[PDB]
Amino acid sequence: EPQTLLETTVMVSTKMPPHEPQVRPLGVYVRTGRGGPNGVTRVVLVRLTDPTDPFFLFELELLEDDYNAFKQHLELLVDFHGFPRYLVGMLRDIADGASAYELSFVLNSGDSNRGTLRVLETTDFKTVEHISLVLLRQG
Amino acid sequence: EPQTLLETTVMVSTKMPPHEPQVRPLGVYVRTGRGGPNGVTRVVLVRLTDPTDPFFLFELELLEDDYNAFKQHLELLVDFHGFPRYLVGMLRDIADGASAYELSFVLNSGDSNRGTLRVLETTDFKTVEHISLVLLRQG
């Protein structure tokens, strides 16, 4: 049951500081499967791509083994099964044009090995970060 | 016009890591006035106290001079006049029992010279931080 829960396009404000950002469409992909040391750990894969650029490929791979730490650090209320569903609900609503939330992706440093994907909500008073995830480049 | 905008009591989850937290009533106090190098800079003072303990006194003093940096770093939409009003609205609603938000105050390190006051909202999916402020002990 290695299932794709989301494969879609979303607008993202991207930047490598100190450069100023651009807003552009990115592919986003969320899949559950198996991995880890003996091939049996449940994983959640979150991938971000640029259709117009192959070098742009960043991934977070989250193992159930590390979830408790991850959960505590982000103050998540959902369990490992719930986590990717929650994420997908948000991302799908943003893709549909049907959400109050925005996406930002900030690279470190081209020669960037990682970026931080943020889900943001702008209230009357400020922008509020709902979640941040670190995604690593490869391939 | 050095005016007190809020003087009240609020429940706060306090902790000095690695100790576990307690929830307890704290005095909170927000005042606008003047200060800075020549006595003319507008300031916002946010004070946290413990009625049952004099050594517990922490303050943030925010000068208009530094607001732009502070604004940008927290992604605030309000200006310097608006900022303390917004903060007070939140704190007063929490004091009244009439808010979806909570307060946390995490000390560094008794021998703590500072803590971070957080305004938190628990959604169905996680706890979301709306704002954090660093307050310094003195006196």
Numbering used by the authors:
A (entry chain A), B (entry chain A): 130 to 238, 242 to 271
Relevant lines from the article:
To elucidate the structural organization of L. major SAS-6, we solved the structure of its N-terminal domain (Lm SAS-697–274) by X-ray crystallography to a resolution of 2.2 Å. The asymmetric unit (ASU) of the crystal contained three molecules that were virtually identical to each other (139 ± 2 selected pairs superpose with an rmsd of 0.70 ± 0.13 Å in secondary structure matching). Our structure demonstrates a high similarity of L. major SAS-6 to previously solved SAS-6 structures (secondary structure matching to the D. rerio SAS-6 head domain results in an rmsd of 1.59 ± 0.09 Å with 133 ± 2 selected pairs). Like these, the N-terminal domain of L. major SAS-6 consists of a 7-stranded β-barrel, capped by a helix-turn-helix motif, that forms a curved cross-handshake homo-dimer within the crystal through a highly conserved interaction interface. In this dimer, the β-hairpins formed by β-strands β6 and β7 pack antiparallelly against each other. Phenylalanine 257 at the tip of this hairpin is inserted into a conserved hydrophobic pocket that is constituted by the helix-turn-helix motif and the base of this hairpin in the B-C homo-dimer (formed by chain B and chain C in the crystal). Dimerization is also observed in solution, as judged by equilibrium ultracentrifugation, and then depends on the presence of F257. Our structural analysis also revealed the presence of an alternative arrangement of the head-to-head homo-dimer of L. major SAS-6. In the Lm SAS-697–274 crystal, the A–A homo-dimer (formed by chain A and symmetry-related chain A) shares the features of the B–C homo-dimer described above. However, in the A–A homo-dimer, the Y215 sidechain is flipped into its own hydrophobic pocket resulting in the displacement from this pocket of residue F257 of its homo-dimer partner probably weakening the interaction. We conclude that Y215 acts to partially inhibit head-to-head dimerization of L. major SAS-6.
SAS-6 organizes the rotationally ninefold symmetric cartwheel, an early assembly intermediate of centrioles that participates in establishing their symmetry and diameter. The cartwheel is organized through the homo-oligomerization of the highly conserved centriolar protein SAS-6. High-resolution crystal structures of zebrafish and C. reinhardtii SAS-6 fragments together with biochemical and biophysical characterizations demonstrated that two dimerization interfaces in SAS-6 mediate this oligomerization: a coiled-coil domain that forms a rod-like parallel dimer; and a globular N-terminal domain that forms a curved head-to-head dimer. SAS-6 is a highly conserved protein that is found in all eukaryotes that have cilia/flagella during some of their life-cycle stages.
